């Protein structure tokens, strides 16, 4: 079978694959059907943004991705409470809610709170009965300036030169990283030997 130089290939064609072959000739058809579903949904919810509710700002959970920010599932109960929005009225307003999300820090809490306040100020609330309005919005902003948003609501998107001082110039970046890795490694056994020496 092998002939001179080559690669040791291991193809996974030992399992009657011809009975399970997924062809994508219906791919253009499912793009039109998905598109017409979007357009019909946008008309059915016409004044509403047609891009779903407003999602919060979320940090990606890994070293590879913790420098980036994306959209989360919903605003947590802690940021909804600080903003002063009831958790059972947020869904009706157009606010996604994630009851199972925690808030480890305060900057991420405050960023999502300010995002909620910006949405509330930017929101137009139509009265339940058009003839009889109550605690809603005025006629000027309702029947004259109401438009359906096109894309996602509030899209989520991702240092001056100075004189180097003598203190940071004499900073051992490589040396500190080496001692730091040693200190973490040796932390437990150093304490145990200190305790044994005490005894």
């Amino acid at each position: 079978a092998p002939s001179r130089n080559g690669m040791i290939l291991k193809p996974h064609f030992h399992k009657d694959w011809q009975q399970r072959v997924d062809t994508w000739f219906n791919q253009p058809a499912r793009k039109i059907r998905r598109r017409k579903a979007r357009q019909a949904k946008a008309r059915r919810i016409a004044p509403r943004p047609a891009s779903g509710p407003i999602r919060p700002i979320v940090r990606c959970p890994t070293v590879r991705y913790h420098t980036k920010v994306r959209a989360g599932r919903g605003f947590s109960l802690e940021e909804l409470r600080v903003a002063g929005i009831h958790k059972k009225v947020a869904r009706t307003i157009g606010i996604s809610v994630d009851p199972r999300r925690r808030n480890k820090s305060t900057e991420s809490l405050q960023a999502n709170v300010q995002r909620l306040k910006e949405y509330r100020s930017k929101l137009i609330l139509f009265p339940r009965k058009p003839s009889a309005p109550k605690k809603g919005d005025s006629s000027a902003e309702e029947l004259k300036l109401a438009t359906q948003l096109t894309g996602p609501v509030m899209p989520i998107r991702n240092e001056k030169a100075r004189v180097i001082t003598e203190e940071e110039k004499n900073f051992k970046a490589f040396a500190s990283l080496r001692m730091a890795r040693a200190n973490a490694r040796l932390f437990g056994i150093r304490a145990k030997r200190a305790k044994e020496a005490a005894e």
């Binding site: 694959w17 399970r20 072959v21 997924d22 994508w24 791919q27």
Partner: protein, 203 residues
């Protein structure tokens, strides 16, 4: 409430009280038929936390199940083929003894809907279960919105499709790293997805 006391009471199955009760009940069920209609649940507290309610349309059936493993039904124990498939005697059924109790109640009572089941007794040769059934065409059931789901045609013979609580346990579904064989809804669904060659138009 009295239901909490009964719940803790049934947890002390080794007690002198519960050993006596389980002995006399198991004896009594052994004199009956394998499929028997019960006037009322033996464990009212266990039934209600499994979905039962004291209303017209809810019935209880007691099922007796032979206990043991699965012997391979091959003549003279001769499985023709390779040695790895020679096992006849220490083979096990994929579904539980409780699942086959629900399946046998549903097959006999075709017009009813299996809701759930629970343990009542146990012997060296038999295991006893009690199955809750709902008559989906009783007016007390299909006028109550909280129980109109069982009347829908998609809930026929849940016990034969592994949709009851006992049946689901054998399917190996869940969340996380222990359950990746069913990460698409079922074992067959996952197998098909990772055994299908995707040939796009632009390759």
């Amino acid at each position: 409430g009295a239901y909490k006391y009964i719940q803790e009471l049934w947890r002390k199955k080794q007690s002198d009280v519960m050993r006596f009760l389980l002995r006399v009940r198991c004896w009594q069920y052994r004199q009956l038929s394998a499929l028997h209609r019960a006037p009322r649940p033996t464990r009212p507290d266990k039934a209600r936390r499994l979905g039962y309610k004291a209303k017209q349309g809810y019935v209880i059936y007691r099922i007796r199940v032979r206990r043991g493993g699965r012997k391979r039904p091959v003549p003279k124990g001769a499985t023709y083929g390779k040695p790895v498939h020679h096992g006849v005697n220490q083979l096990k059924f994929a579904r539980s003894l409780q699942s086959v109790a629900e399946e046998r109640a549903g097959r006999h009572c075709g017009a009813l809907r299996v809701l759930n089941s629970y343990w009542v007794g146990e012997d060296s040769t038999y295991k006893f279960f009690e199955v809750i059934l709902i008559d989906p065409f009783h007016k007390a059931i299909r006028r109550n919105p909280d129980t109109q789901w069982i009347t829908k045609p998609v809930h026929k013979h849940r016990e034969m499709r592994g949709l009851t609580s006992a049946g689901r346990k054998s399917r190996g579904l869940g969340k996380g790293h222990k359950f990746h064989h069913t990460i698409g809804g079922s074992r067959r669904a996952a197998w098909r997805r990772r055994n299908t060659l995707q040939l796009h138009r632009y390759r």
